Amino acid sequence: NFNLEHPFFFTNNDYSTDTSIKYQASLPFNWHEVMNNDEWVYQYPIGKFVERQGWKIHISSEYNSSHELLQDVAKICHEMRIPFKHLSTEDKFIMRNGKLVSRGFSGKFITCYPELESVLQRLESALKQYNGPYILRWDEAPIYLFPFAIRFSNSGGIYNKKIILKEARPYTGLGFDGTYSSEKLASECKALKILNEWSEAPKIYWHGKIWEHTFLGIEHMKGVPLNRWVTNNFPLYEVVDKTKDYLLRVSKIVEKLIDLTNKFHSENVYHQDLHLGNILVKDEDEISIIDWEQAVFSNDEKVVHKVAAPGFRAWRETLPSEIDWYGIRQIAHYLYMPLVTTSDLTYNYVSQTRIEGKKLFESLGYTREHIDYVESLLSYLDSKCPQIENISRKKVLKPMHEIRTIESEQDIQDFIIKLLRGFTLTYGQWRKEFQSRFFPVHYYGLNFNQGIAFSDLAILWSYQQLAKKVKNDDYYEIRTQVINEAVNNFKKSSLSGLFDGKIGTIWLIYEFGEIDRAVELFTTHFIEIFENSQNKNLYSGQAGILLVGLYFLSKGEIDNKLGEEILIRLREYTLNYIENPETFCKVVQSNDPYENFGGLLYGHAGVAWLFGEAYKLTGESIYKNGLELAVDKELVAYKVDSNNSLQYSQGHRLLPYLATGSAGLLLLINRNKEILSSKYLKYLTSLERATDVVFCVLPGLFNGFCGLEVANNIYSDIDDNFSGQKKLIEQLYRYLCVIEEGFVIAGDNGLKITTDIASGFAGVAIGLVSIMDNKLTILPQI
Amino acid sequence: NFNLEHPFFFTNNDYSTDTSIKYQASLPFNWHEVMNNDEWVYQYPIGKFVERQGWKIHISSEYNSSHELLQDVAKICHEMRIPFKHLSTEDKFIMRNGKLVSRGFSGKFITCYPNQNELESVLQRLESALKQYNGPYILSDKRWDEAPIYGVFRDFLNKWLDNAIRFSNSGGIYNARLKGKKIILKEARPYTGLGFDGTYSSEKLASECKALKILNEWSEAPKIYWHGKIWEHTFLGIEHMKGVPLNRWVTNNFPLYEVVDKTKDYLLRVSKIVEKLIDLTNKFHSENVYHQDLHLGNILVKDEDEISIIDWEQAVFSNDEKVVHKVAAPGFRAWRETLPSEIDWYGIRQIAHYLYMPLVTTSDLTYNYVSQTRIEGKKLFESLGYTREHIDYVESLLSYLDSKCPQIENISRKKVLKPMHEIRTIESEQDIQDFIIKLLRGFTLTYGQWRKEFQSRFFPVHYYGLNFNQGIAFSDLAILWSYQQLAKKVKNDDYYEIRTQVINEAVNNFKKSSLSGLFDGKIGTIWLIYEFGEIDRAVELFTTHFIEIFENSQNKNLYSGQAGILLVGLYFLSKGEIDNKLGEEILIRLREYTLNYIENPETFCKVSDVQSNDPYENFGGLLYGHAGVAWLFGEAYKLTGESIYKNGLELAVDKELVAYKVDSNNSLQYSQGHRLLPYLATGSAGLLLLINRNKEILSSKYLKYLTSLERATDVVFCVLPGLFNGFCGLEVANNIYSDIDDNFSGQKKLIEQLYRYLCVIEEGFVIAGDNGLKITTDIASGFAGVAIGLVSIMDNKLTILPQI
Numbered sequence A: 001n002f003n004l005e006h007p008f009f010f011t012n013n014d015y016s017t018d019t020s021i022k023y024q025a026s027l028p029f030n031w032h033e034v035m036n037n038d039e040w041v042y043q044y045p046i047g048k049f050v051e052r053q054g055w056k057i058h059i060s061s062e063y064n065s066s067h068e069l070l071q072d073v074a075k076i077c078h079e080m081r082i083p084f085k086h087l088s089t090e091d092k093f094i095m096r097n098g099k100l101v102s103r104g105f106s107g108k109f110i111t112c113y114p115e116l117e118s119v120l121q122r123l124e125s126a127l128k129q130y131n132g133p134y135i136l137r138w139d140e141a142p143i144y145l146f147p148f149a150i151r152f153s154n155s156g157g158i159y160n161k162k163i164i165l166k167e168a169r170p171y172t173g174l175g176f177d178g179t180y181s182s183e184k185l186a187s188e189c190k191a192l193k194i195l196n197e198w199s200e201a202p203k204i205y206w207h208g209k210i211w212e213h214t215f216l217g218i219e220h221m222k223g224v225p226l227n228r229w230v231t232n233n234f235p236l237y238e239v240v241d242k243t244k245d246y247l248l249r250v251s252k253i254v255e256k257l258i259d260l261t262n263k264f265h266s267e268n269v270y271h272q273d274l275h276l277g278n279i280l281v282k283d284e285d286e287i288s289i290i291d292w293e294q295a296v297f298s299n300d301e302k303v304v305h306k307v308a309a310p311g312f313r314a315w316r317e318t319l320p321s322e323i324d325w326y327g328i329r330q331i332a333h334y335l336y337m338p339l340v341t342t343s344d345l346t347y348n349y350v351s352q353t354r355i356e357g358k359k360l361f362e363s364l365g366y367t368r369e370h371i372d373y374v375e376s377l378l379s380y381l382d383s384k385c386p387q388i389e390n391i392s393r394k395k396v397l398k399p400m401h402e403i404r405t406i407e408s409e410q411d412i413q414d415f416i417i418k419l420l421r422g423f424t425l426t427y428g429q430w431r432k433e434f435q436s437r438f439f440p441v442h443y444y445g446l447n448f449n450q451g452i453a454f455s456d457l458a459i460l461w462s463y464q465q466l467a468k469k470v471k472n473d474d475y476y477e478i479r480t481q482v483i484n485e486a487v488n489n490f491k492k493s494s495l496s497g498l499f500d501g502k503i504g505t506i507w508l509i510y511e512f513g514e515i516d517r518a519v520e521l522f523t524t525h526f527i528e529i530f531e532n533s534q535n536k537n538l539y540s541g542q543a544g545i546l547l548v549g550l551y552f553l554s555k556g557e558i559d560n561k562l563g564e565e566i567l568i569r570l571r572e573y574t575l576n577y578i579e580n581p582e583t584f585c586k587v588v589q590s591n592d593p594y595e596n597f598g599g600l601l602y603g604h605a606g607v608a609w610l611f612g613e614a615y616k617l618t619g620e621s622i623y624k625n626g627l628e629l630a631v632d633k634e635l636v637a638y639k640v641d642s643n644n645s646l647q648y649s650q651g652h653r654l655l656p657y658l659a660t661g662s663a664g665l666l667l668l669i670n671r672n673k674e675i676l677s678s679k680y681l682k683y684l685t686s687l688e689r690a691t692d693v694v695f696c697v698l699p700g701l702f703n704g705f706c707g708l709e710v711a712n713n714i715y716s717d718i719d720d721n722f723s724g725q726k727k728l729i730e731q732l733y734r735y736l737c738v739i740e741e742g743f744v745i746a747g748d749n750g751l752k753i754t755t756d757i758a759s760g761f762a763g764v765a766i767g768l769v770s771i772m773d774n775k776l777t778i779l780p781q782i
Numbered sequence B: 001n002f003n004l005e006h007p008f009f010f011t012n013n014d015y016s017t018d019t020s021i022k023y024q025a026s027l028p029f030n031w032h033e034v035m036n037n038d039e040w041v042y043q044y045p046i047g048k049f050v051e052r053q054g055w056k057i058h059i060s061s062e063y064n065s066s067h068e069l070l071q072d073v074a075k076i077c078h079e080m081r082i083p084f085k086h087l088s089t090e091d092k093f094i095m096r097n098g099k100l101v102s103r104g105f106s107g108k109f110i111t112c113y114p115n116q117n118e119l120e121s122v123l124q125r126l127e128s129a130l131k132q133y134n135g136p137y138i139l140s141d142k143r144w145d146e147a148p149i150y151g152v153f154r155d156f157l158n159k160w161l162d163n164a165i166r167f168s169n170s171g172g173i174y175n176a177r178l179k180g181k182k183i184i185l186k187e188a189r190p191y192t193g194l195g196f197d198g199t200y201s202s203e204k205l206a207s208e209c210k211a212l213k214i215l216n217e218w219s220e221a222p223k224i225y226w227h228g229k230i231w232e233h234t235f236l237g238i239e240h241m242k243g244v245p246l247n248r249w250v251t252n253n254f255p256l257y258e259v260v261d262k263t264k265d266y267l268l269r270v271s272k273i274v275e276k277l278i279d280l281t282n283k284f285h286s287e288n289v290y291h292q293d294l295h296l297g298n299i300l301v302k303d304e305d306e307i308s309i310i311d312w313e314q315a316v317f318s319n320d321e322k323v324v325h326k327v328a329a330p331g332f333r334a335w336r337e338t339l340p341s342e343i344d345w346y347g348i349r350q351i352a353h354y355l356y357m358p359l360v361t362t363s364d365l366t367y368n369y370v371s372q373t374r375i376e377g378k379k380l381f382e383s384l385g386y387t388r389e390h391i392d393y394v395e396s397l398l399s400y401l402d403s404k405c406p407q408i409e410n411i412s413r414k415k416v417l418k419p420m421h422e423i424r425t426i427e428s429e430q431d432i433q434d435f436i437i438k439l440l441r442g443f444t445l446t447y448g449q450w451r452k453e454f455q456s457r458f459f460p461v462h463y464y465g466l467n468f469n470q471g472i473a474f475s476d477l478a479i480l481w482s483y484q485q486l487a488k489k490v491k492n493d494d495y496y497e498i499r500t501q502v503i504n505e506a507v508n509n510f511k512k513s514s515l516s517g518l519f520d521g522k523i524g525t526i527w528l529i530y531e532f533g534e535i536d537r538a539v540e541l542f543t544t545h546f547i548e549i550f551e552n553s554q555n556k557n558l559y560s561g562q563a564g565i566l567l568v569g570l571y572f573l574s575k576g577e578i579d580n581k582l583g584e585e586i587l588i589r590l591r592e593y594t595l596n597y598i599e600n601p602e603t604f605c606k607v608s609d610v611q612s613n614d615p616y617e618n619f620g621g622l623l624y625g626h627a628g629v630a631w632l633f634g635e636a637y638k639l640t641g642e643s644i645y646k647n648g649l650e651l652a653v654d655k656e657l658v659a660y661k662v663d664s665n666n667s668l669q670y671s672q673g674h675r676l677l678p679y680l681a682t683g684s685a686g687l688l689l690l691i692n693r694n695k696e697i698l699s700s701k702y703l704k705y706l707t708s709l710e711r712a713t714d715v716v717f718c719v720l721p722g723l724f725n726g727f728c729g730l731e732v733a734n735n736i737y738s739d740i741d742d743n744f745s746g747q748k749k750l751i752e753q754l755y756r757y758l759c760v761i762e763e764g765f766v767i768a769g770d771n772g773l774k775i776t777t778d779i780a781s782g783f784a785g786v787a788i789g790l791v792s793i794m795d796n797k798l799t800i801l802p803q804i
């Protein structure tokens, strides 16, 4: 809920400052100027009888000369009573009258509240030389009370030969540099009427300024976005290619764009906005460019990039020929692998995702004669854009240049050592600036403190479990601080569950150490965690609380009374299961946890873990009956793929991986070999053809490739571990940054560094344990 | 302690934030950056063991070409092996080379850590790019070579091995003689001393070489005798002359009593000081000389009224632009963009307004503030009655200074505060009480604007005790208690929640207190619970903590020592609610206390030679010395009737009267360095607070001193408005123990003399504090001081010490 940008981490909305030019009134006594909202300077005067403050009057302003409106408005206040209040700084002026705010809070810069004669001529006589930012009638001045809808805005809009409608009402859409939308409509009116020879660019029709509104209407071009072409045409599955002839299809895009980009550099026009929402590929691979809103008609000036898409912003000032060659660089690298999203934080990002590409095509098997071609075309693009310096302290995130293969277990020995150091590093850059949480985390879980999730001590348990999995600073003092902090705030939290709730930290007060303190905490608090109805899912609900309770019962340290009625609670809960499966979970796309409604962790297959867990230590028939329904009703939402596979279908997106995909059910079948019949054990063949893809963008255990490999290489009845680790290691090298002697992992929507079990350091640290230790140690098995 | 400026209150070194133009170089493929302690950024190779203790390299820079040296030694030291660190913001470059930061941290912008086998190698190609740069002089560091290159981390370099009144980082404001004729010097050193409109010391110092040469011939200006360059260090010499500063001259020649000076004739004396200034400030504002800085420590009045303005080291030589005032004075600075000729009408104007009623100090916090020190000077000299014919002359001649001044539009957030413009005279009852009706708004309106922008405390305080949140003194519990007793005096807000979080963390942080004492320690927080309206918590905390509090206490005075502990002990015994066996024990503890006291009082409190305003640098006084012991013995003689305890009163007042001197007015006054102190807590009001009402015990030997102190505590004007160090105690102490009923002289003189101290904020009468660039609500100089002193005459005993 709290989106803000900081160099490295995310932070909640308490970090930003207001270092701007302030506004100032110079008014006499019997008026207050006391601030109360940090927006206005709030004034109710002295010696009053204040009215009920009904219908209000309003005055608006423009950025061109508003050091002269306020001073003339302030000299009206010497005569008569008025609630005079203006805005604080120019930053609130830009935000109030600019890009994305509502229509109600736009145009307001100075305030009068109507008791009076409702008219005064000397304010009308010192003004009406200023007119602009109208708000959508009693007098003159600024007072505001045809030759023929995909993105609404208060500034303008885009509305559906059929023609599109690009418009801009006057004096709006102010940026940090003072330019407007109608100031760039004329920029398109120059920049596309200067070149009408080409067929890959529309025709300008300014039809009329009805009222006074700047319009620019261009016809609908034909083509597809290049992202959809990549995800519909990249060799994800290994046989979808038409016996090669795709890296030659790359040569159409990597020749047409180069042969077109040098020809508008001879017309003194530079487009300066080059991302993947502009290049539209027609049928029979014809290209088309759009959105010429940022065209500067100069070469010797230097502009730092202001508005772009995520991925392709320039770095610390360059000549504007380079702000169109940088796009042709990082889009011709985009076709090779789809990995450019991190490049807003990491500069010169495409070296490691271009080195591994030749290794990818030689492993899949392509002819070298076709391959040695695009590697020279990309080498030609290094001549145009020069090396620039990395400033603004996003500069430590350094991509690797050398990558070596895997030949022994010592590769896994040093991988863990170079992964654990990048947890001390990302703590040492978080503790020095903030103190609300204690470890950095992905932005949606930015205020959570409990359970196996976006957390504070689950990541510390993941830190020590792999550190004990490997052999040989300040673990114990931070250990003592977080253990005391957890037990201090164990109350006053209003959520219950295993991954997010209260009994999760009961599990890690057991497993983290401190065996006794866990059992008086359990005997004190388990019943008032339990009894209060609520939900049923393993992420947050009664199955999460109950299963770690039976883990405690089967461990062997419990009194007889608790071992009686806790087993009575699970005997009750499985009988309340009986026939109705829609109670716990549902039988659109996102990457945040709470709006998902299916999978292993968020869905039906979590209850299957409990039903398979109870059968050992019980051995009775009803817990066998519940298990196969719990596996079968998870597979309702699976559709047969194009080539003999099964995936989770949520919207247009296709879902691999552990949390909400085929991998969790594959792992759950792979564990329970003995109780499952031959009809359900034969589904390994279809799911193994699903969980072996060559590319999946997210790196985490809860999201992406680590969940794909930890489902395959875990049980298998075979003690082979080296081939179980080698594939995940060699195909997780393309998702890593390098900070000092160590690695970090950027989370989903990657512009960050994170530590969590929901796509960060700790997720791969659990998965690499679960490869060799064969338990999946963050899910209760006993 | 902890002082920092802010538009209104003071605060500690937290509210500073930062804004500057930043820094920082590149890093190709083998490096890392860390944010160490918010004034360095640090780059080092990814894994290398280097060296301990051997050698490092410090690089300074210059403010004009600062960035162009970072990208000159970034890439010349990325090659080979050099790890380094440097400063992060420009405003810390203003501080590291500056004027207030000492010698130890100076000339340091970039710090480098080469390895021991490369010390010749790391600089031989690093220096060659730097030959067109230069920087500050070498302090707290060593010399290596030309260009800006010159400890612990976690070789070839062996070869190269009259008086002073101010010390600063600029170089000195020293005083010497020619190789004679007496010379006042200034000094500077390379590229040092900057502001936020940063210009160097050798720029402002050379910006008077024309201003003292244009005038030169005149008889009231310095004459430059020597000027030149012995080194790059700049020596400017102007001739020393005799005289007295005007701020000392005002206190030397003002009527402080009605009987100080005969012949009358003081408004005729201030005629030659307000004509010579006004024609002098037109004589040199024609030949292009504009002196921006003018204050009371500048004009040296000579024998028989002769002004001698010096130190013209802020001179601007043309007036066709509007500038802001850059360096201020304690009380005098311009306001919002005026020409350099009209920074001598908000200049020399307010200097000659110090000759009438000497309070101009809070003009930095209140715009204008000569209305109150001009309106209520005419009243003073009509009540004192020198001559009426001089009054209109001086008023018109000051109005001409007002006439030449421009009316600047007032704009800041230091502009809520106007000076007050109407003053009544009280004779009736309701005119006394209306000041109480709106002085309470001066306590309410200073509460919001401290808590809403800073949350580390609860109430604004004077900066001497800022992190001392316990006691009767600078505190939190005593402040809200002083409010309640004054509010009960007037007839007819939500202070119940306020007092419950006062009571809660009055005792929550009781354990985390390293000091014990009556006014600033543990036991004061105990018995404010008893006098604030809770009777049982006082007893429980009293037993359970006060027994170890009396165990661990060390000192024997009554501020922070043993005396007030057993004093409030006998207070609790006299009211006698819960004590019994503990009361018998406390009486026993008093028995070994007094008999150990009676042997030699010299080694419990010292029987003052330091000029200070600090609570912990005092030796003699009522609270701060021996009269508190006589308060305890005076009360111990009352309850029991025991005849041993009368012998302590005579010994205490015999020891306290050896310090006071006799002067031309035959006034017995406190001696503290060179300063006479008629005040409640550190002087002559203390013994008058003690001696009377103990006149039913003592008969003849200690009632002949009452009339001398009664006459000696009758000053007309003193500057501080406080209880323990200000005026308000002097109108309490003079009639506090009156055996004849008298209230109008106790509530009319004090509220006629405390009209000259008040700002407005908004419909309020807010008091300022010690060194009053601030509004404070504390008990020494603030809201609680006047809230206790007015109640004191009304309830006729006292409300700072517990009565037995």
Ligand SMILES: Nc1nc2c(ncn2[C@@H]2O[C@H](COP(=O)(O)OP(=O)(O)OP(=O)(O)O)[C@@H](O)[C@H]2O)c(=O)[nH]1
Residues within 6 Å of the ligand: B165, B166, B173, B184, B239, B240, B241, B242, B243, B297, B298, B310, B311
């Ligand atoms: N007795 C005497 N003292 C002088 C004379 N000329 C200058 N001074 C000294 O100069 C000092 C001026 O002090 P300030 O008002 O602080 O000015 P400053 O020395 O430039 O220091 P700043 O506050 O930074 O401006 C006085 O304290 C005097 O001691 C003189 O002719 N006679």
